[PDB]
Design an enzyme around this catalytic site. Structure first.
Site, short mmCIF file in Angstrom:
data_model
loop_
_atom_site.label_atom_id
_atom_site.label_comp_id
_atom_site.label_asym_id
_atom_site.label_seq_id
_atom_site.Cartn_x
_atom_site.Cartn_y
_atom_site.Cartn_z
N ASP A 337 -1.07 -4.46 -0.26
CA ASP A 337 -0.70 -3.83 -1.62
C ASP A 337 -0.88 -2.46 -1.79
OD1 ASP A 337 -0.47 -6.72 -1.52
OD2 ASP A 337 -1.99 -6.94 -3.25
N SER A 362 -2.05 2.34 -5.04
CA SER A 362 -2.63 1.02 -5.37
C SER A 362 -1.68 0.44 -6.44
CB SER A 362 -3.96 1.36 -6.13
OG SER A 362 -4.58 -0.04 -6.46
N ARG A 363 -1.04 -0.73 -5.89
CA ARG A 363 -0.13 -1.42 -6.63
C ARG A 363 -0.79 -2.39 -7.60
NH1 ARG A 363 4.52 -2.81 -1.74
NH2 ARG A 363 4.47 -0.76 -0.80
N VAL A 364 -1.68 -1.65 -8.40
CA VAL A 364 -2.37 -2.63 -9.42
C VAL A 364 -1.81 -2.12 -10.87
CG1 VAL A 364 -4.19 -4.36 -10.21
CG2 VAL A 364 -4.04 -3.00 -7.77
N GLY A 365 -1.42 -0.88 -10.95
CA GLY A 365 -1.21 -0.35 -12.32
C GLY A 365 -2.31 -0.29 -13.33
#
Ligand SMILES: Nc1ncnc2c1ncn2[C@@H]1O[C@H](COP(=O)(O)OP(=O)(O)OP(=O)(O)O)[C@@H](O)[C@H]1O
Ligand SMILES: Nc1ncnc2c1ncn2[C@@H]1O[C@H](COP(=O)(O)OP(=O)(O)O)[C@@H](O)[C@H]1O
Ligand SMILES: [Mg+2]
Ligand SMILES: [Mg+2]
Lengths: 495, 69, 467, 48, 57, 68
Positions: A337, A362-365
């Site tokens: 991710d 970081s693909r969590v936002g």
């Protein structure tokens, strides 16, 4: 004296199925015999070694050995246990050092366990999952503010040799002490470390470093060093994932680290070639992608119907001369991710840790991040983004101020070794920088100011930190207090 | 069972010894002495019950003694 | 014990068939009917009472049907305190024409690595008298050291300088193993060790043992010499309490020799023609050269890189078995800087403030930052020129160019063909000399005064003469 | 051991007669900060 | 700490040597005549054991 | 059947009598008598793919006490 007499005080023999050896060489044995033998089943040799069957052919069975092969010779006897390979599991393994098959090598004694679990199992599907919502704190200033990580996520650490990959994980493991030494069980985290391909002295120094900070009471170390057979290095990561999965299904949270995933693929390639299978690109097997895809899919966040547990992963990759477009790295980049990039040129320019903030993602936002940190980090993002686009040329109204602020902001992110920080202290130290209280001092002296101000704030203002910790956000009264504290200490601190 | 009882009998025979191993070993004592010497060197020399007690004075005493005082 | 018959001979691989009593793997066998002793080693069990072996000598004159006899144990060599001052070979036979070696016990070549609970974790420093190593990547006691370099760049001159500076003052013993190198260099080393006094031919006060197999031997021999050195190195560590120095020359030939027989054994090549089992058999050998709770061993190894390539599979798997690295470059050697050590590619494990002190660490980090900054201006200078830079950039260029010169040094072992005199600098003088340059106290001197000198005081005098 | 020190204002402390006493105050800053840091580092109560 | 460590080391050494002595004397004591008589007793015992195993189809 | 010392022929026919009992449905068993004195003592039996080991291999079991 009587202890050994009691040990020998505590013998049955029964029929078993058997095959005979036809050939042996370089760790591969061809066995004539066994008829009702399952695929991926554990068999046992005469002397005491163990093996696993992979190739089932009309006239022979190909068996790989879990250890040395100087004792096997033509004409011997092989027996079948009747069970697929599995490892012991439980929470009696905390504080112990074990090999790839669950045997103690630290000299303490036997492990008292009551459960076993297979190493090859399927990941949870679509129904039993839920979104990621909770934070996972590390103690690194440049990570917790720009590249946050949640619980249930996978994140990649990638770089060249001698850049600082191991120390990030070592610092992350140590930081968890302040939570495990508490009351509530909803904020505790257990750790697992797996070493593949390294030499023994490095692992000994790592274990000594861990034990002098009082961190071994909640860690498990699984090791398969460079002197072990290839099948053990190939089997090590799954044996640790299967130990991590125990906590996930009982409402607890855990963390796992695979050191140098690049060294598992070389052992897989060696093991496959000796079985007479055709090679591929760079003689790697045809399905090296499936080797890691079924491994990194087992980390998930479970919903309340299944308990609410979680499991987090942090793989490691090494690249040759900073080449990120190679064969192996591109496979693992497209699975995780996010990734953190480390570079040598930043390492030698005094930027340590050498994190490249222009490429790390970081693909969590920031869905799982404290409210207080967002206020002071969202504004630092813009400052650094605007600093990078101008301040590199190999007026005073805009340009001079921009790089005057940027050079200050860069110096704030540097950090030492083996010393993580709590969240509120980072919030305070970033709050000092972002508001402009340090736009007059020469940049060369910022670090001394950071250290002295942190010590003074910790000692004389212990009540202020608790307010930020408990509330989770800043307030008007807190903001009023901090300005006076900062201005007074800045005035007094001129040395 | 037969091997177990034979080994139990021999263990009892070992217990019949007045003290120490039946085979004392020409080099067992030497190896033990070498290991003890190595342990003493690594851990440092220590007496049976020596408890020294010496207290120093105040180091680097800073004062206001100056011409402008 | 048992007799067999030769069935096939191809190059350095021979197959034998046994009627009864099949020997186990790693045993030695003897050939019957030859003038000179010839020994074979078992490697595989094929089937139908046949084995495949590897020879340790030339195999010319062998006929199908000849007899082979079994011994019952692996290769054994004489080990003890009477190997000091003698010269051996792969299978432990004296080649110094001085009679047999009368020791009490023997030992087998193949053994197993020390366990996990026997490791030591102490760290100290070792002073060599060379400015670059002490300032940037210092060594340690009881650790592993590697020297990387191409062809013609100077690894063995550095190994001989390290021998001259460290070996003489050592109180313990030393072992030198030579694998795949020139014979005349071995003869030179033997004669100069006779002259110095390390080797004494009339009493028992020698402090070095030598094992040799050079580049005129078949590949079977060159794949096994390093273990012969390792055994005599380990005896002085376990049975006796001593500190041992081990020097190995071009351990790369251990790997190359193993790929010349992989094809004949019937395997699929992996990459760039290398054998599939490249990391495991290197890990088996390397893990035995360690420091345990019974003694210490200090290793210095020379490594070779084919076609000036650091990504080749052979030297790219040795980085994980070292505690200190020193990389040599041909471009630096072209400019005339000796030793040609790259300052932006050498590391050490004990470079931290809590071991070497704060001042040393600050000086090293400052010099490395200054060196890095000057490298990023090369493209602009190479085309547009020096005039486009501002004042600060010119100042950094001048200081970096001054710092580069001061890292060179004259060696004593090179006085014969250079017309200079050897020098040896203490650590404090190097630290202070680099501090003074970083502070800008010598900005009024020409850059040619910092070339091939020792302590900083020699720069001002050479500048004064060169008015 | 227990301590009873007096809180001070360094801003007003600098205002007191500094002539020929700047060096003394500069030393006092270092001593006052460092001794407090060392004292806070170790517990006042005796060890276990 | 020093004294406790030394005593523990001595205990470990003695246990190891006793185990070695017991095993070696087991091998030494086993004699050919003992083997003959024990093998006769074992012939009876193992024949009965084979009967027991064969009684379970 | 493997043994350290040559068993008596009367014990041999008793062994045949019980081995036929294990054989059950089939034909006349083929008996290979082998005398290997390497083992201290005991008896080793193979019947097709079945295998029962009752010999001096128990020394390894007794040695395992040292491990635990
Ligand atoms: N923040 C830091 N400050 C100072 N030194 C650091 C820092 N981080 C790492 N180092 C140093 O960098 C060096 C390499 O660190 P590390 O062992 O983590 O590297 P690595 O990427 O794991 O290397 P390898 O490929 O050899 O395993 C060590 O000497 C370590 O002390
Ligand atoms: N310190 C030095 N001073 C002067 N010349 C050197 C030095 N080191 C190497 N050389 C040059 O290199 C040559 C020797 O190279 P050598 O050490 O044999 O390389 P390698 O070790 O790679 O075989 C010499 O002829 C010499 O000209
Ligand atoms: Mg690492
Ligand atoms: Mg050379």
């Amino acid at each position: 004296s009587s202890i050994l007499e009691e040990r020998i005080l505590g013998t049955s023999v029964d029929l078993e199925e058997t095959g005979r050896v036809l050939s042996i060489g370089d760790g591969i044995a061809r066995v004539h015999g066994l008829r009702n033998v399952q695929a991926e089943e554990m068999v046992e040799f005469s002397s005491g070694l163990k093996g696993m069957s992979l190739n089932l052919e009309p006239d022979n069975v190909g068996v790989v050995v879990f250890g040395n092969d100087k004792l096997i010779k033509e004409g011997d006897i092989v027996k079948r246990t009747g069970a697929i390979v599995d490892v012991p599991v439980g929470e009696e393994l905390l504080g112990r050092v074990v090999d790839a098959l669950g045997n103690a090598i630290d000299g303490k004694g036997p492990i008292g366990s009551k459960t076993r679990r297979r190493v090859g199992l399927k990941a949870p599907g679509i129904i039993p999952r839920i979104s990621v919502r909770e934070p996972m704190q590390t103690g690194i200033k440049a990570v917790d503010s720009l590249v946050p990580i949640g619980r249930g996520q996978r994140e990649l650490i990638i770089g060249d040799r001698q850049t600082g990959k191991t120390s990030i994980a070592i610092d992350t493991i140590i930081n968890q002490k302040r939570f495990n030494d508490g009351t509530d069980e909803k904020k505790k985290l257990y750790c697992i470390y797996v070493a593949i391909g390294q030499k023994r002295s490095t692992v000994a120094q790592l274990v000594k470093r861990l034990t002098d900070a009082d961190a071994m009471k909640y860690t498990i170390v699984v090791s398969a060093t460079a002197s072990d057979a290839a099948p053990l290095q190939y089997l090590a990561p799954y044996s640790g994932c299967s130990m991590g999965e125990y906590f996930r299904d009982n409402g607890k949270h855990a963390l796992i680290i695979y050191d140098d995933l690049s060294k598992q693929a070389v052992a897989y390639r060696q093991m496959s070639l000796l079985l007479r299978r055709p090679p591929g690109r760079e003689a790697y097997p045809g399905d090296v992608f499936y080797l890691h895809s079924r491994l990194l899919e087992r980390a998930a966040k479970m919903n309340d119907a299944f308990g609410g547990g979680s499991l987090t992963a942090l793989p490691v990759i090494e690249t040759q001369a900073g080449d990120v477009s190679a064969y192996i790295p591109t496979n693992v980049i497209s699975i995780t991710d996010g990734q953190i990039f480390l570079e040598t040129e930043l390492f030698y320019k005094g930027i340590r840790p050498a994190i490249n903030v222009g490429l790390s993602v970081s693909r969590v936002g920031s869905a799982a991040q404290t409210r207080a940190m967002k206020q002071v980090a969202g504004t630092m993002k813009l400052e650094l983004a605007q600093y990078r686009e101008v301040a590199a040329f190999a007026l005073d109204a805009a340009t001079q101020q921009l790089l005057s602020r940027g050079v200050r902001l860069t110096e704030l992110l540097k950090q030492g070794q083996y010393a993580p920080m709590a969240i509120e202290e980072q919030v305070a130290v970033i709050y000092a920088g972002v508001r402009g209280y340090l736009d007059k001092l020469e940049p060369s002296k910022i670090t001394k100011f950071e250290n002295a101000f942190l010590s003074h704030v910790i000692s004389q203002h212990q009540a202020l930190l608790g307010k930020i910790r408990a509330d989770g956000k800043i307030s008007e009264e807190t903001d009023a207090k901090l300005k006076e504290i900062v201005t007074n200490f800045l005035a007094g601190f001129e040395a | 069972q037969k091997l177990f009882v034979d080994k139990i009998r021999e263990y009892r025979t070992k217990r019949q010894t007045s003290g120490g191993p039946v085979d004392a070993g020409p080099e067992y004592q030497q190896d033990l002495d070498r290991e003890l010497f190595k342990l003493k060197q690594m851990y440092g020399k220590a007496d049976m019950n020596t408890f020294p007690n010496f207290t120093f004075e105040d180091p680097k005493f800073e004062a206001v003694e100056k011409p402008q005082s | 014990a048992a007799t067999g018959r030769i069935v096939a001979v191809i190059g350095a691989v021979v197959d034998v068939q046994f009627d009864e009593g099949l020997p186990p793997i790693l045993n030695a066998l003897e050939v019957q009917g030859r003038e000179t002793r010839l020994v074979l080693e078992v490697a595989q069990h094929l089937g139908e009472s046949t084995v495949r072996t590897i020879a340790m000598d030339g195999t010319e004159g062998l006929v199908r049907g000849q007899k082979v006899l079994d011994s019952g144990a692996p290769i054994k060599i004489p080990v003890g305190p009477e190997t000091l001052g003698r010269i051996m070979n792969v299978i432990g036979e004296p080649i110094d024409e001085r009679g047999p070696i009368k020791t009490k016990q023997f030992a087998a070549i193949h053994a197993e690595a020390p366990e996990f609970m026997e490791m030591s974790v102490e760290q100290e420093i070792l002073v060599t008298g060379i400015k670059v190593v002490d300032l940037l990547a210092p060594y340690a006691k009881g650790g592993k050291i590697g020297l990387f370099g191409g062809a013609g760049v100077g690894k063995t001159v550095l190994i001989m300088e390290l021998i001259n500076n460290v070996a003489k003052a050592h109180g313990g013993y030393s072992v030198f193993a030579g694998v795949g190198e020139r014979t005349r260099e071995g003869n030179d080393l033997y004669h100069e060790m006779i002259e110095s006094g390390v080797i004494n031919l009339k009493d028992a006060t020698s402090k070095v043992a030598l094992v040799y197999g050079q580049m005129n031997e078949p590949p079977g021999a060159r794949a096994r010499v390093a273990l012969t050195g390792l055994t005599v190195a380990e005896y002085f560590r376990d049975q006796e309490g001593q500190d041992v120095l081990l020097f190995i020359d071009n351990i790369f030939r251990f790997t190359q020799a193993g790929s010349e027989v992989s094809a004949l054994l019937g395997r699929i090549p992996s990459a760039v023609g290398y054998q599939p089992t490249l990391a495991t058999d290197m890990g088996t050998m390397q893990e035995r050269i360690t420091t345990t709770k019974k003694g210490s061993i200090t290793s210095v190894q020379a490594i070779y890189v084919p076609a000036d390539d650091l990504t080749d599979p052979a030297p790219a798997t040795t980085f994980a078995h070292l505690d200190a690295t020193t990389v040599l470059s041909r471009a630096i050697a072209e400019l005339g800087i000796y030793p040609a050590v790259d300052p932006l590619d050498s590391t050490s494990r004990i470079m931290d403030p809590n071991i070497v002190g704060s001042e040393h660490y600050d000086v090293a980090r400052g010099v490395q930052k200054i060196l890095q900054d000057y490298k990023s201006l090369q493209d602009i200078i190479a085309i547009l020129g020096m005039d486009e830079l501002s004042e600060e950039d010119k100042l950094t260029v001048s200081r970096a160019r001054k710092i580069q010169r001061f890292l060179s040094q004259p060696f004593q072992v090179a006085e014969v063909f250079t017309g200079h005199l050897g020098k040896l600098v203490p650590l404090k003088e190097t630290i202070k000399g680099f501090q003074q340059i970083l502070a800008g106290e010598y900005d009024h001197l020409p850059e040619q005064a910092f070339y091939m000198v020792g302590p900083i005081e020699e720069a001002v005098a050479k500048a004064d003469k060169l008015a | 051991r227990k301590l009873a020190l007096k809180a001070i204002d360094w801003v007003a402390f600098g205002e007191i007669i500094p002539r020929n006493q700047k060096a003394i105050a500069n030393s006092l800053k270092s001593w006052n900060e460092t001794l407090s840091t060392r004292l806070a580092a170790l517990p006042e109560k005796p060890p276990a | 700490d020093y004294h406790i460590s030394v005593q523990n080391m001595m205990r470990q050494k003695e246990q190891e040597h006793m185990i070695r002595w017991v095993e070696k004397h087991v091998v030494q004591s086993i004699s050919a005549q003992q083997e003959k008589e024990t093998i006769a007793k074992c012939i009876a015992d193992l024949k009965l054991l084979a009967k027991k195993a064969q009684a379970q189809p | 059947v493997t043994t350290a010392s040559p068993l008596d022929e009367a014990t041999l026919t008793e062994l045949k009598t019980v081995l036929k009992s294990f054989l059950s449905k089939g034909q006349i068993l083929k008996l290979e008598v082998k005398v290997d004195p390497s083992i201290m003592g005991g008896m080793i039996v193979r019947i097709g793919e079945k295998y029962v080991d009752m010999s001096a291999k128990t020394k390894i079991q007794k040695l395992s006490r040292a491990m635990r």
